[PDB]
Coordinates of C-alpha atoms and ligand atoms in Angstrom, one line a residue:
X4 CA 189.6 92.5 144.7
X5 CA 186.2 91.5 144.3
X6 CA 185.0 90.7 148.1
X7 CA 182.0 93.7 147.6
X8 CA 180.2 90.5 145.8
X9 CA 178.2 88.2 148.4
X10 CA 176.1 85.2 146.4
X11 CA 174.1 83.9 148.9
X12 CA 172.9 86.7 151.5
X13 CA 169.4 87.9 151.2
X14 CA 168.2 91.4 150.2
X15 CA 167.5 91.9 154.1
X16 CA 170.9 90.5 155.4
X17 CA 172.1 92.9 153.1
X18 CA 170.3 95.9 154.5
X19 CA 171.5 94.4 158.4
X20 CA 175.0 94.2 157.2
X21 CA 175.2 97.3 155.8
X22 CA 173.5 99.1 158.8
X23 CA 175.1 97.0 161.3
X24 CA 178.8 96.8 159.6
X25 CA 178.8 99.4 157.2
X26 CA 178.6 103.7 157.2
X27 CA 176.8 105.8 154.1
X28 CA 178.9 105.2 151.0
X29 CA 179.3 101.3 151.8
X30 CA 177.6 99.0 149.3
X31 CA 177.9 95.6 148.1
X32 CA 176.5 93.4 145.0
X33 CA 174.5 90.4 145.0
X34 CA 172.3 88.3 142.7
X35 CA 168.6 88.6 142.9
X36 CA 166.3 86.8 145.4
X37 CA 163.0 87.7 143.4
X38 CA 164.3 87.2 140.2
X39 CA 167.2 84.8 139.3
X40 CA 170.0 86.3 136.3
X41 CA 169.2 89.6 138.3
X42 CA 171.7 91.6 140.1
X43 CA 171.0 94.4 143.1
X44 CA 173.8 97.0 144.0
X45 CA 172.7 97.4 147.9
X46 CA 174.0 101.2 148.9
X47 CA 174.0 102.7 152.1
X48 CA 173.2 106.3 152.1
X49 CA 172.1 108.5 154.7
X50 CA 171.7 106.2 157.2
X51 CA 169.1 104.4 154.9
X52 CA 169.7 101.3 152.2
X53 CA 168.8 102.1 148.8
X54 CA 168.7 98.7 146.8
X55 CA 169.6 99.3 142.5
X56 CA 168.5 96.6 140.1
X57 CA 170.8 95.5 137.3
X58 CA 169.6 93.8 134.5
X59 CA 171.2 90.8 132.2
X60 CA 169.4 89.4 129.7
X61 CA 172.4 88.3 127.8
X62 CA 174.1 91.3 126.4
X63 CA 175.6 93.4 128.9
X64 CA 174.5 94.5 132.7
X65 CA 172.2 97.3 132.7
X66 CA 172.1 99.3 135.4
X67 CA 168.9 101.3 137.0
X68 CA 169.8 104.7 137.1
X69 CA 173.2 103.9 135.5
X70 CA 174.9 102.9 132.7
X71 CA 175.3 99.7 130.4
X72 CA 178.7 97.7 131.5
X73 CA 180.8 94.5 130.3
X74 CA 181.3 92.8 134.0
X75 CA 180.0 94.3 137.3
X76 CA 183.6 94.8 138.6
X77 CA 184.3 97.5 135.4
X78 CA 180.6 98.6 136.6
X79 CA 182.0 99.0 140.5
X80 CA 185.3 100.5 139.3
X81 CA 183.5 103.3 137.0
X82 CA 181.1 104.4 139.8
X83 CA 184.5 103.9 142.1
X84 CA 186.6 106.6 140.1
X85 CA 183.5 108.9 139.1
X88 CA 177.8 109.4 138.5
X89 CA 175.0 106.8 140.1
X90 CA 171.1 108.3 140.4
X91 CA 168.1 107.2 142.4
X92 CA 164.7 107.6 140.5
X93 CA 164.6 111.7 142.6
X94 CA 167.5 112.4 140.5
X95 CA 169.9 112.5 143.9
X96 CA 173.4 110.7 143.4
X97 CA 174.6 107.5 145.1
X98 CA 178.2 107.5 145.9
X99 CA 180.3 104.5 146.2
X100 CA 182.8 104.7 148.2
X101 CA 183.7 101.8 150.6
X102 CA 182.8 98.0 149.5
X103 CA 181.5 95.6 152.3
X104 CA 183.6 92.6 151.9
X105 CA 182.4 89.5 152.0
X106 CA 183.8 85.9 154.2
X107 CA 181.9 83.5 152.3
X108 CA 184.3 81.0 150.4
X109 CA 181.7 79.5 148.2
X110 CA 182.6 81.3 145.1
X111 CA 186.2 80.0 145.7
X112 CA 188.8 78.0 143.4
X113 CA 190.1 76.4 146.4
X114 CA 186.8 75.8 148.3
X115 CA 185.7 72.1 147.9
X116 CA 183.4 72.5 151.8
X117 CA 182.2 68.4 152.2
X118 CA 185.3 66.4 151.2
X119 CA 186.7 63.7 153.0
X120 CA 190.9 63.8 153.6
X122 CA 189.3 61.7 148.2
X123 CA 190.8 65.5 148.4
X124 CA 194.4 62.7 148.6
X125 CA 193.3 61.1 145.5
X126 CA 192.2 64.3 143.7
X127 CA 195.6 65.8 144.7
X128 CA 197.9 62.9 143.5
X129 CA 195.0 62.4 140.1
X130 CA 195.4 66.4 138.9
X131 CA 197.7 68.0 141.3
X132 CA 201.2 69.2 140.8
X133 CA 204.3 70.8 143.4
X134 CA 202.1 73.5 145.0
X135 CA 198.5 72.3 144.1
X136 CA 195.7 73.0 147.4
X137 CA 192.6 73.0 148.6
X138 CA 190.3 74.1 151.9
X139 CA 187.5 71.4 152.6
X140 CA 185.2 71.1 155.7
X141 CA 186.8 68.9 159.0
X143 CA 186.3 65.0 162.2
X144 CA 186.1 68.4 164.0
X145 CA 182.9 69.7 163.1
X146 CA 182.8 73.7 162.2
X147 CA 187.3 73.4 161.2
X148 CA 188.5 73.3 158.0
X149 CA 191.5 71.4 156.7
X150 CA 194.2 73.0 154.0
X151 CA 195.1 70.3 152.1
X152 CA 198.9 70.8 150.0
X153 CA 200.6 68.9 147.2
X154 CA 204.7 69.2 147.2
X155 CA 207.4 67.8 145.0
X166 CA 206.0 64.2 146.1
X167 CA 203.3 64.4 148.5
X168 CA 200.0 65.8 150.5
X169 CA 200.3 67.6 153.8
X170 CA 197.1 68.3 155.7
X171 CA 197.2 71.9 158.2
X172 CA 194.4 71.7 160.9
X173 CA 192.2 75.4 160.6
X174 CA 190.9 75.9 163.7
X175 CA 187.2 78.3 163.3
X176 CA 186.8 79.9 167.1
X177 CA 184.9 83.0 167.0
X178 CA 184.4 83.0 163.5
X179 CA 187.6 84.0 163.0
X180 CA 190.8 81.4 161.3
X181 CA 194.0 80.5 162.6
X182 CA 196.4 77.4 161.6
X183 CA 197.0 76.5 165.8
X184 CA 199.2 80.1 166.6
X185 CA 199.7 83.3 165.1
X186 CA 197.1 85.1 163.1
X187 CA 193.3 85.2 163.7
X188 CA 192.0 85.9 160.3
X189 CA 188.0 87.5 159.7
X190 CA 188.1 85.2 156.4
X191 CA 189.1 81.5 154.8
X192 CA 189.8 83.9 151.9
X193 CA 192.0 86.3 154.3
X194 CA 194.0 83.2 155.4
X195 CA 194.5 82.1 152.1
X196 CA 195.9 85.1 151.2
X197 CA 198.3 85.4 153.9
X198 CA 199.3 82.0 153.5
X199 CA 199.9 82.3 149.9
X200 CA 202.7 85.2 150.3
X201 CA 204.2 84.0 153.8
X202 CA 204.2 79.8 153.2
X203 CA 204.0 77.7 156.2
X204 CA 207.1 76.0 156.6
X205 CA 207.4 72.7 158.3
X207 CA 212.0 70.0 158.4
X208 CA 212.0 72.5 155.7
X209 CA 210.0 71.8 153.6
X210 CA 208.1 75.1 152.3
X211 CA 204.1 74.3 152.1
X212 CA 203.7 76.7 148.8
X213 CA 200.0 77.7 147.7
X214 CA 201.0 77.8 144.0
X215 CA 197.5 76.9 142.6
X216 CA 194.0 75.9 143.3
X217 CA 193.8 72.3 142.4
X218 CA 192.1 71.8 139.1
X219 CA 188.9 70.1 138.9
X220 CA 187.0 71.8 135.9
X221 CA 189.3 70.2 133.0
X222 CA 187.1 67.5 131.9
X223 CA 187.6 64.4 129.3
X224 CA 185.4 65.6 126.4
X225 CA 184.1 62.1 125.9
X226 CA 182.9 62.6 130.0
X227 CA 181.0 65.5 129.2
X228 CA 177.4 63.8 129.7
X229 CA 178.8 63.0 133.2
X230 CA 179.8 66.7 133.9
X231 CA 176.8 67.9 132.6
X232 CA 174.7 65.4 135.2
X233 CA 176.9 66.7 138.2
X234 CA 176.1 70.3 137.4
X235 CA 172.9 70.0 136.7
X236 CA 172.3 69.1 140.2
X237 CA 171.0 71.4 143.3
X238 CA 174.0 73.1 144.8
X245 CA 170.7 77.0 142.1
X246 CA 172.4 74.4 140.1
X247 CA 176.4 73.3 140.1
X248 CA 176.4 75.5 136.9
X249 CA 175.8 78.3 138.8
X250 CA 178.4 77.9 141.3
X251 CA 180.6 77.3 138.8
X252 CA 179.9 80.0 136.8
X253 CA 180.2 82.6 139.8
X254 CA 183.8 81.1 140.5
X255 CA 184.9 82.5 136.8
X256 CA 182.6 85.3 137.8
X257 CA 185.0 86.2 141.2
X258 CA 188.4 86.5 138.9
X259 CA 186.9 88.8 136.9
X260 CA 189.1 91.6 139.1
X261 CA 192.3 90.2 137.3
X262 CA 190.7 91.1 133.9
X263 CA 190.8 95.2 134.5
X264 CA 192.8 96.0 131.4
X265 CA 193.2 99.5 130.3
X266 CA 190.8 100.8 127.3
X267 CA 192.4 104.1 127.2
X268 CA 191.9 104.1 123.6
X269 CA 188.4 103.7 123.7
X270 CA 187.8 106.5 125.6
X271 CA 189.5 109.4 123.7
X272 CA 187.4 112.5 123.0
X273 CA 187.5 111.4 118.8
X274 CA 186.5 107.6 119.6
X275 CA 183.4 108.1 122.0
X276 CA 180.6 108.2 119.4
X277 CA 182.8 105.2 117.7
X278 CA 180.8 102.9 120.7
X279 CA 177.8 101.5 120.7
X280 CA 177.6 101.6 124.9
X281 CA 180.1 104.6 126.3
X282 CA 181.4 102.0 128.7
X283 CA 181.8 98.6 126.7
X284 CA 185.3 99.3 125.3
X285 CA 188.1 97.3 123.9
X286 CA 191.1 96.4 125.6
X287 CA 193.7 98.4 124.5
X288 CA 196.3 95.4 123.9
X289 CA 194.2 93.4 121.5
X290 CA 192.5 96.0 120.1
X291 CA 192.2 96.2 116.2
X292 CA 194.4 99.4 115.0
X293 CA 193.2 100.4 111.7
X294 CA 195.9 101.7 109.0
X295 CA 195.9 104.0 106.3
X296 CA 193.4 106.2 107.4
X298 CA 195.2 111.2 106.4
X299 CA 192.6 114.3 107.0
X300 CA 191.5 112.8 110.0
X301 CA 193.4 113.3 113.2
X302 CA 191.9 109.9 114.6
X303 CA 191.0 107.1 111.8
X304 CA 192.8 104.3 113.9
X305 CA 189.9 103.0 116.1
X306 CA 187.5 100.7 116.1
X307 CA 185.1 99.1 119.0
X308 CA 186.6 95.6 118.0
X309 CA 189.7 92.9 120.0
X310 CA 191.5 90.1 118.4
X311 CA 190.3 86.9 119.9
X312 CA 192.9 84.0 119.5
X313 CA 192.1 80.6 120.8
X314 CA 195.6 79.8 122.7
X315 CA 196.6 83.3 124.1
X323 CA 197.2 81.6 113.5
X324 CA 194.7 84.8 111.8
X325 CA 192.9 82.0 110.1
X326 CA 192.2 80.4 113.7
X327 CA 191.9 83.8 115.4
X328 CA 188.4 86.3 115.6
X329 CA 187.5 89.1 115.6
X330 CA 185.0 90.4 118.4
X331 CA 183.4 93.5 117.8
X332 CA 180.1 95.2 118.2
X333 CA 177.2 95.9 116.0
X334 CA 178.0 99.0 113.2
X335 CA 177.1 102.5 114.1
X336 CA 175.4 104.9 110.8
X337 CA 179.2 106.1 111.9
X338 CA 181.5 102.9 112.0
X339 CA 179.9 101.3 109.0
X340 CA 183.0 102.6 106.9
X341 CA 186.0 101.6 109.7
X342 CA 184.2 98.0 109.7
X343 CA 184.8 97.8 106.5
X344 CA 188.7 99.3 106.5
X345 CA 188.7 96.5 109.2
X346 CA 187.2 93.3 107.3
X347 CA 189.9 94.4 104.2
X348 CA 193.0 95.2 106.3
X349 CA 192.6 91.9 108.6
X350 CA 192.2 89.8 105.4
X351 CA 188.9 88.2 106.9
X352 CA 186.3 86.3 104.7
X353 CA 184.0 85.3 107.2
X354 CA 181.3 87.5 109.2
X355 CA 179.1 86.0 112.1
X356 CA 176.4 88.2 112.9
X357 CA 174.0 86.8 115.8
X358 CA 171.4 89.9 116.4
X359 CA 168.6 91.0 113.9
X360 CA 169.1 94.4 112.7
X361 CA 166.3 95.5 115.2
X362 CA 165.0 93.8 118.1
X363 CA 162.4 94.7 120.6
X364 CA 161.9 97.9 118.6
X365 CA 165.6 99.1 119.4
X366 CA 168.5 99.1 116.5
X367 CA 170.8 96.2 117.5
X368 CA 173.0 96.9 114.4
X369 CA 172.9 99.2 111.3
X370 CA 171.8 97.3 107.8
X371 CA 175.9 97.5 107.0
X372 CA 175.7 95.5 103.1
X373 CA 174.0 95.8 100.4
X374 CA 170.4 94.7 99.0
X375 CA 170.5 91.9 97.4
X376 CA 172.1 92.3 93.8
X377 CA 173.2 95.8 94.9
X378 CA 176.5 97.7 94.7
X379 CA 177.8 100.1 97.4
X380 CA 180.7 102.4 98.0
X381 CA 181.4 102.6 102.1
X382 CA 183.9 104.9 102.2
X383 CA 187.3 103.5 100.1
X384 CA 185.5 100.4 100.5
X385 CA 183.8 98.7 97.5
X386 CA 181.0 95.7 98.1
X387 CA 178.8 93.8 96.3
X388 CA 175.6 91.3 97.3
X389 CA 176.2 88.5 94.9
X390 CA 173.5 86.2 96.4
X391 CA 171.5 85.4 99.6
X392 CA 170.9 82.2 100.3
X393 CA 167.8 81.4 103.4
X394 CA 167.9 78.8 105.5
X395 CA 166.1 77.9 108.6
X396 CA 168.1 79.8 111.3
X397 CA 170.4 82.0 109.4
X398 CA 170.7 84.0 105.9
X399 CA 173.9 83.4 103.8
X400 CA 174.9 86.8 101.8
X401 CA 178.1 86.4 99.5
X402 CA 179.8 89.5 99.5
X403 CA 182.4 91.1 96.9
X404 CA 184.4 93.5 99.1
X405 CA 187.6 95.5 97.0
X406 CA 189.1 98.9 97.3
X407 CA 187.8 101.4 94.9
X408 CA 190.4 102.6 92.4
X409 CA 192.5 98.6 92.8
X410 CA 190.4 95.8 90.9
X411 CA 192.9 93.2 91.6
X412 CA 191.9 93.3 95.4
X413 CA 188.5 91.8 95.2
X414 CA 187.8 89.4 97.8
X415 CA 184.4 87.2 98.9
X416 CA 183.5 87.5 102.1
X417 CA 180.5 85.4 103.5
X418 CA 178.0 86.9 105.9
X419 CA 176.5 84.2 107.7
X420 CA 173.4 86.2 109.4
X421 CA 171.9 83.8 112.3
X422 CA 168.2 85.0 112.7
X423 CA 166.6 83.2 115.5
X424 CA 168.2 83.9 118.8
X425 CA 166.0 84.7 121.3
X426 CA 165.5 88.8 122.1
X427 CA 166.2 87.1 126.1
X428 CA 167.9 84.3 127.0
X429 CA 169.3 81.6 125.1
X430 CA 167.8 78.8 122.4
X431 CA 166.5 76.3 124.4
X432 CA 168.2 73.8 122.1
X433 CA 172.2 73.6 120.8
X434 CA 171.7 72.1 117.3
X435 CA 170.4 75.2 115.1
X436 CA 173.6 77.1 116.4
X437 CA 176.0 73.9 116.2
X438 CA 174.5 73.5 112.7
X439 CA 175.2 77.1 111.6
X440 CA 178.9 77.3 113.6
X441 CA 179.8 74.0 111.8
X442 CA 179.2 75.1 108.3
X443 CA 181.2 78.5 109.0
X444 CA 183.7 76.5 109.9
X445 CA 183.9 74.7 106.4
X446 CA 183.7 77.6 104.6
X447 CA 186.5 79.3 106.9
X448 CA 189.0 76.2 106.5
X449 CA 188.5 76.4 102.7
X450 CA 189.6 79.2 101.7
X451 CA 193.5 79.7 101.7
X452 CA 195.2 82.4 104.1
X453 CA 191.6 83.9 105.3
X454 CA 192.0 86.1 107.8
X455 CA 190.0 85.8 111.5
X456 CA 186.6 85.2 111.5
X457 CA 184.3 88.4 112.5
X458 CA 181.9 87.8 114.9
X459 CA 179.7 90.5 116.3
X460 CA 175.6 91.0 117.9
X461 CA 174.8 94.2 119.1
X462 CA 177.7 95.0 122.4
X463 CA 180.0 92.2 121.0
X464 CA 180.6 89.9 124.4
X465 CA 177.5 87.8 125.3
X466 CA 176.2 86.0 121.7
X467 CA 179.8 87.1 120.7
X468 CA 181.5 85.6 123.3
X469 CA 179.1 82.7 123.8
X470 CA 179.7 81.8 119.7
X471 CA 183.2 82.1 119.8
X472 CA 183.7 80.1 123.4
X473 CA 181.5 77.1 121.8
X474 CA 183.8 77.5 118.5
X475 CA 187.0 77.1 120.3
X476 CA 186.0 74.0 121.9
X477 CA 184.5 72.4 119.0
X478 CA 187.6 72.7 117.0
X479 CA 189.4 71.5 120.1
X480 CA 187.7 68.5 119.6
X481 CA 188.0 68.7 115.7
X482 CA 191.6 68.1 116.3
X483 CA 191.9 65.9 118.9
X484 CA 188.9 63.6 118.7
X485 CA 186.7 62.7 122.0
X486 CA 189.7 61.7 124.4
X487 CA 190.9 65.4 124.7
X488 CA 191.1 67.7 127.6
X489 CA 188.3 70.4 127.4
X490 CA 188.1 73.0 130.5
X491 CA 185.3 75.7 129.9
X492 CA 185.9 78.0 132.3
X493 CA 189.7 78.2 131.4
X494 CA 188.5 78.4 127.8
X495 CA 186.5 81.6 128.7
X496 CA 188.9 83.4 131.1
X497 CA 190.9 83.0 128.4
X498 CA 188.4 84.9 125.7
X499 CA 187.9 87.3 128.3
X500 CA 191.6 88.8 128.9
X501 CA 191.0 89.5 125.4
X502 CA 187.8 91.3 124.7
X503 CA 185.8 92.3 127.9
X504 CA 182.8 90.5 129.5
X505 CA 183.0 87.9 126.8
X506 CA 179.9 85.7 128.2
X507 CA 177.7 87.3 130.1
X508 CA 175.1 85.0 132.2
X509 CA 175.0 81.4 134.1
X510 CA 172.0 80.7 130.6
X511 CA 175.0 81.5 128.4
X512 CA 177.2 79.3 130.5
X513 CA 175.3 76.0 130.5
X514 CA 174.6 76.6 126.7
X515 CA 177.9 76.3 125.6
X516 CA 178.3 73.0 127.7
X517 CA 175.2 71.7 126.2
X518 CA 176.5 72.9 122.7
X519 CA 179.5 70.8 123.2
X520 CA 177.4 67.7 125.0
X521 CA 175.1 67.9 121.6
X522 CA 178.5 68.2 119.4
X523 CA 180.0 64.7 121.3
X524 CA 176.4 62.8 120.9
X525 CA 176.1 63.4 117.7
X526 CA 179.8 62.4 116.7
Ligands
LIG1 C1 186.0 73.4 144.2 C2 185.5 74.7 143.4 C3 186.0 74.7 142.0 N1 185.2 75.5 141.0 C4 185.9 76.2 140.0 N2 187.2 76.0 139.8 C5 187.9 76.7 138.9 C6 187.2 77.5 138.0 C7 188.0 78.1 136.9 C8 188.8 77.4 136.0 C9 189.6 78.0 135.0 C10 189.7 79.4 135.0 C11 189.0 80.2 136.0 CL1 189.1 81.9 136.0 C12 188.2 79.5 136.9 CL2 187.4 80.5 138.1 C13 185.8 77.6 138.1 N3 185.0 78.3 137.3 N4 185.2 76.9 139.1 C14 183.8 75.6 141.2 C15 183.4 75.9 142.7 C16 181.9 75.8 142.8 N5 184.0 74.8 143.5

């Protein structure tokens, strides 16, 4: 569950509910008021409503008082199980979330939609597909079901604001209703009115994209946002374990204590013997259907410490391709340790062997051509090309696609020619939002490669996708609508 996130209530709605509805230990999230791409973790604590700022500038959500996390669900779960300070040093304890009724954030809230929700169920729908739209009876809802085939409209009566179908349940919630509905189906005749799916309405023809791009660039906050915040809700589904991650021998293996790698996809390393623990690195296996020469490899910036496992990692998976999108310092703070060699320079990382044969400059990125072999085995040389891109913002995102599309398209080529490479590394300073946001706009470029204009792309699909892989991968609504204006920007230019 997610329901302690509200997106629309104020900061002083939030203090009312919470005095009104909650007791000390209740608390909810909610996106900032006074600054949009802001968060603030609303707690109620002796008697009184503390309100916690949480940064997200593109890299991970930053916490006042707290700690650095991947999504704000793995933030709430952490605080959940454990500690949270106010600026006096006393702790904040979370202990019951204030749920939210609000459907707005909903797969299967459409609100204004005449009974067109027909011709978008027999378009896109399948056996099962539904939907909850605004009623004419002003202030009811209609639940709108595909089956086989055909549509079947329930009547949801709002008295009280509380839901019911005509008898039965009163539910506090659309969402509650849902729910209930979903595991005990409303059956007519027989036929069983099954809630297998939220009909699909994000899978887009790429050549429509321009289109898409108009209707979510429109006031709702922008369609983008409330898009976003929908991928943003089923982030609850995503609460893999990273028990590996947080052994005793792996915690200074991690850039940020809390941003760890699933445990399912995460790269083992091999042939480590002196050391109890040599298997671990902060890195996942990113494949785009969910082949190793189709496949990445997420992971975070190097650590003085994890220089040598990076490079056990690079050898073992067979990769020939690094994208790194951070500078090796940014706004005076160490993003990622200087991991290769000067220019013409030989180093020994480890068992690990490299060479710079040549940099190469070019507008938004540096090219460094990199011998990488085992010491003691000549015949296992490899090249492996380090495509640095220089000029991403220290906030935000580039406030135009092509330098990026530019420098992804060209690490493409030199990915697809060379014979049985292994997945591409791609890393900034955590390893989810440049990361994720590179690798995202990657997937659905080649997509495209592939398939031409007439395919199906679906972005949010593409990313929930990325992100059962590697946590948080994409972190903020600016990240978002860049990778739909890097694949607008690919389609033009095509
Ligand atoms: C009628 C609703 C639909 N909607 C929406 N529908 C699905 C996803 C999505 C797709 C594929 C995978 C995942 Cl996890 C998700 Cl949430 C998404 N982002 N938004 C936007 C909302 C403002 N209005």
């Amino acid at each position: 569950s997610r329901r302690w996130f509200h997106p629309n209530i104020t900061g002083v709605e939030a203090e009312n509910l919470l005095l009104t509805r909650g007791v000390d230990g209740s608390f909810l999230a909610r996106p900032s008021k006074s600054n949009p791409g802001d968060f603030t973790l609303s707690v109620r604590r002796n008697g009184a409503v503390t309100h916690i700022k949480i940064q997200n500038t593109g890299d991970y959500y930053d916490l006042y008082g707290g700690e650095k996390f991947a999504t704000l669900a793995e933030l709430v779960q952490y605080y959940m199980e454990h500690q949270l300070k106010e600026k006096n040093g006393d702790v904040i304890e979370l202990k019951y979330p204030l749920n939210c009724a609000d459907p707005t954030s909903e797969r299967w809230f459409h609100g204004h939609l005449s009974g067109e929700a027909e011709k978008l169920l027999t378009e896109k729908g399948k056996h099962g597909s539904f939907l909850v739209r605004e009623s004419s009876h002003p202030g009811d809802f209609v639940l709108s079901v595909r089956t086989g085939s055909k549509v079947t409209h329930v009547m949801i009566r709002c008295q009280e604001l509380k839901y019911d179908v005509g008898g039965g349940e009163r539910f506090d919630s659309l969402t509650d209703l849902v729910e209930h509905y979903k595991k005990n189906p409303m059956v007519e005749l027989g036929t069983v009115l099954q809630l297998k799916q939220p009909l699909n309405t994000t899978r887009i023809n790429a050549a429509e994209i321009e289109s898409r791009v108009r209707e979510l660039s429109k006031l709702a906050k922008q369609g983008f946002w409330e898009e976003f915040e929908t991928l943003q809700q089923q982030e609850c589904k995503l609460l893999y374990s990273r028990k590996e991650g947080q052994r005793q021998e792996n915690k200074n293996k991690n850039r940020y204590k809390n941003i760890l790698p699933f445990d399912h996809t995460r790269v083992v390393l091999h042939d480590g013997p002196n050391e109890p623990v040599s298997d671990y690195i902060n890195a996942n296996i990113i494949m785009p259907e969910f082949k190793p020469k189709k496949s990445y490899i997420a992971t975070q910036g190097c650590l003085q410490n994890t220089v040598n496992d990076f490079w056990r990692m690079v050898f073992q998976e067979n990769s020939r391709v690094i994208v790194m999108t951070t500078k090796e310092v940014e706004r005076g703070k160490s993003k990622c340790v200087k991991y290769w060699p000067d220019e013409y320079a030989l180093k020994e990382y480890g068992v690990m062997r490299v060479r710079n044969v040549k940099e190469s400059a070019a507008h938004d990125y540096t090219l460094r051509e990199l011998k990488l072999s085992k010491v003691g085995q000549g015949n296992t040389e490899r090249t492996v090309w380090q495509y640095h891109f220089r000029t991403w913002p220290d906030h935000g995102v580039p406030s135009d696609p092509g330098g990026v599309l530019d420098f992804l398209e060209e690490v493409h080529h030199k990915q697809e020619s060379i014979m049985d490479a292994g997945p591409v590394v791609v890393h900034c300073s955590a390893g989810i939002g440049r990361t994720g946001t590179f690798i995202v706009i990657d997937i659905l470029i080649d997509i495209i490669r592939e398939k031409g204009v007439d395919c199906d792309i679906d972005v949010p699909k593409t990313i929930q996708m990325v992100r059962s892989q590697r946590s948080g991968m994409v972190q903020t609504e600016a990240q978002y609508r860049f990778i739909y204006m890097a694949v607008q920007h690919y389609i033009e230019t095509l």
